[PDB]
Design a protein around this ligand. Sequence first.
Ligand SMILES: COC(=O)C1=C[C@@]23CCCC[C@H]2[C@@H]2C[C@H]([C@@H]4CCC[C@H](C)N4)[C@](C)(O3)[C@H]12
Lengths: 285, 55, 223, 232, 339
Amino acid sequence: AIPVIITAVYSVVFVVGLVGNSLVMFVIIRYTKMKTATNIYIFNLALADALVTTTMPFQSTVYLMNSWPFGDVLCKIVISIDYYNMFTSIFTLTMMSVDRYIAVCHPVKALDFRTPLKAKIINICIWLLSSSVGISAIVLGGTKVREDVDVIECSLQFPDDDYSWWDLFMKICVFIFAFVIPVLIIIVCYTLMILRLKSVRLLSGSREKDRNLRRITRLVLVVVAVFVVCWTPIHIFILVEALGSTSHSTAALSSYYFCIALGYTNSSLNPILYAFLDENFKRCF
Amino acid sequence: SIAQARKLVEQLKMEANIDRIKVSKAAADLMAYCEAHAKEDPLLTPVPASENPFR
Amino acid sequence: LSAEDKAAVERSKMIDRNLREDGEKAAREVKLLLLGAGESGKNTIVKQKTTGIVETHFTFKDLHFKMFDVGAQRSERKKWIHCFEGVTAIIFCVALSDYDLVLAEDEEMNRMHASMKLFDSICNNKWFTDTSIILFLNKKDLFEEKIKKSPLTICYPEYAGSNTYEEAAAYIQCQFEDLNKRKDTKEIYTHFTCSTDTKNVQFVFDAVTDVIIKNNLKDCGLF
Amino acid sequence: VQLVESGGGLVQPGGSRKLSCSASGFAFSSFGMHWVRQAPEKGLEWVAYISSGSGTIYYADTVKGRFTISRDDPKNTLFLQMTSLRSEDTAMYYCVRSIYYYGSSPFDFWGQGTTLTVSSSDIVMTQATSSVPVTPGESVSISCRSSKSLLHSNGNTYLYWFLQRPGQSPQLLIYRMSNLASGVPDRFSGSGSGTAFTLTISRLEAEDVGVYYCMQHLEYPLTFGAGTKLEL
Amino acid sequence: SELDQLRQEAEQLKNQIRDARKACADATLSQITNNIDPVGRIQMRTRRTLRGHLAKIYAMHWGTDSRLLVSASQDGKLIIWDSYTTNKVHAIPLRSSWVMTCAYAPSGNYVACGGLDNICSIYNLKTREGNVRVSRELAGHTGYLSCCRFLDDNQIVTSSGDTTCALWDIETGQQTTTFTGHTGDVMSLSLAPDTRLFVSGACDASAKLWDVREGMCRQTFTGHESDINAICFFPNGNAFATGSDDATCRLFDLRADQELMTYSHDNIICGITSVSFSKSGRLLLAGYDDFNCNVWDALKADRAGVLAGHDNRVSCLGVTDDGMAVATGSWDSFLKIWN
Ligand SMILES: COC(=O)C1=C[C@@]23CCCC[C@H]2[C@@H]2C[C@H]([C@@H]4CCC[C@H](C)N4)[C@](C)(O3)[C@H]12
């Protein structure tokens, strides 16, 4: 009865993701609108990961019946939009941390860098830079029939070339641009923000101010944890599988499915965590 | 101190000798003014689509 | 709609664009509410016919400062002090060479108790529960030659301390910073300055920097 | 308020020129400029239009794709560039101010005009009468006819009345149904409903004679009426 | 003891006027207007929201055409509003951002704007030169200006915060009449349809009748326990209502000089920032600090409905001169119009 509960977990994650990304989007569209410089950012996050919350039945039926009776183009475009929304979620999280660092440590430039016009320009620019990979997924996406048994899978394959170093360069490039530059920027922005906010006249004088600083620090460290320790198994397992010939496995290869399950839980948890931990949303509700 | 007090007492003294109408008649013609032209009050009865330019 | 109405709504859109672009300038403008007792030393910090609010402007380190003095207004304070919700910080200028002379025009109380009443009135407002203070305790150069001839206990019968610079200064800091009913939301930034001292505009810039940091933690849902 | 035209003159056929107007003495950035020409043997016709801040551009059908209009608000100048102009464009051009809001008076001020000579479903207005013999101190009532109705959905009639004195610029006289412009004495009265339009003058003076014109401002282009000159 | 004797005889004649006010009355308004049909629920939804301000609004005023309204705020902008189509007719910049009064002239050619600068600025709207420029810098007030209603195109009545009201001119710029007799700062002003008397509201809960031609008080109204913040004048001309800062609105009499009726509830606690009538005289609009307004049945002292929908505190509201709609300005940079 192993796959009995796993599909139930997939279904409940699917429905809570739908509920969260519908309620947050409806509240943002109705009450607060595009007022602040972070409401548009959390709107971008919700509009990004709505696709991830809707690909849950596809992933669940793939894991359930071990195949895909879909076609040839639609799972390709699912993969393309998945790459697109994931990359534009990572880049908006990175630039939101950059925006918070500009707000805290650089108040002379925070008023000139946190205007809604500048925020819209920056997020549209990084969306158009993610559009290059989004259309490259259309260019080099496809399908390949495996030789072990007459079933197929939706993945990326370079068209008719040796291209082993090309594939290795692509894997190390996506790994670096996922968890080297963005995680480095997250860490060196948040720890410098914490260092600046600790050594300032406010927020370090009384017990309530110290508790406020502790709450802010634990909130940003929980956000960093939910990012890193949850999304890291997927990338490290893909890097291990693509570094050499470690791609043959057994029924123990369900660790890939547990990794994609964690990557589908945290993609729904992150906007829910932001909405339910921002007390501005509590005043809005 | 002195001149201000003189001005105040002479002002309220000339305020004193003023004929005052009975308040029942004041409420009566208050009712008369609020009733005689209560028909053309869009705040009381909402205007139809021919009137009411706000839409 | 008519062509005249089309040109009218085009003019309205242009007016909206002008309003947006000159309300964009209001972000960089840091407003300071400068106020205090009469001849308490608030004049010497702005050196470096309207009969209303004195308007002055200066900039330093790429930040626009406007000081909004209400010293020429002698009306009831409580019915126009509610206009200052969006002030960045409050400048409270009271001197130290005022403990001995009581009023120099009338005889009701001392200058120090008047400053206590003013600071108590400005600290407990419903409109000023979060506005930081950059309180200046100036004229300390003339305070020391006036504290040797007359002790501080002639106005404060609860001092019972040594008659010197450091003890009297520390008692002054303690007696100005204890009037806040909520020190967990507003820390008074006491500072010493003279007529011919260095620039306190660095301290003002640091204080408004802290206030802008507080606002940036406010509007991002992290406060 | 001054609208001084510049440039122009005799031009070879198929050539190009540059009509510039030094529109100084007033707030140029808040007024939507126009361009109205007048043939020597005919009446007034509008050829171009630019709104405030170059927001909206409208052209006449005869000069669309042939005429270029441009403005520069800091320099307070209104330009008009024409290329390959024909002999049909032989006219004298007027610069016109027009501001648009509630209660505003469009087409309020006109320019002196510079002559341009070439060497060698539109709501039109008809006024059949011309060269009306009138006496000073009497009352006259000219008439104007429109192709369609001018009562829009917001309950007003967009009809403009003017007066072109001999050897002088046209002046705004009545700028809607039954209202008076600025500087016009309380003698010129406007009335009429639907498509039938008229003017009313109580006691004609020596300076009241001239050619009168109509205009609609409901759709573009902005064609005028006919000649309604007055004679002693 | 000259001062004590004059004070005690002044108190004696104050008891004389108080006993005259008591003995002139026979019945209250309740027991003679409680037998009429009550006003039902005045459910008035907002129609036009004049967004575009970027600061809190303290003053609005309608016009005689009942279409154009002007608004003053701390954005440094005086904005005229085409209320029919939600259009900005003008955006007048201000030399002083601290303004709390504005008024639209009955001729429609002028607009007033003054405040904490103690200088009344009057702007000429319809000029041959196409722009809006200030005409006269009316100065002479030692306190903060609070209301600047236009008597006509050439006379303006300005009430300041130095216990004085004043009548000004345009062609000269001097004070024709100075009104004295308050002990608190004046915060409200309201003219009359016949334009011969105007009532004021000061900080000492005192409302007077300053006549215009000769310039002195006619009668004194002291019924409130807090300062009177807003005042408004009945369309008949024999009454006026005051809005104070103790959750009470109350009518008075121009001729019987007595309290008529109070408009208060146990639920409402905060004060009144803006009060106005309807042109029929039965509804009494009143803006509170609970982020909403209210319609008051003036003949029943009953809350006929709420006008909730404003984010921040309403500070200014006025009705049209034909009684078409009420526009409620507030501190949320919004101008809701209700009908
Ligand atoms: C080095 O990291 C990668 O190669 C990638 C990491 C992620 C998770 C983190 C965001 C980006 C994705 C892309 C999409 C991929 C899978 C392919 C199989 C189908 C699933 C739905 N999506 C992937 C394995 O997972 C890939």
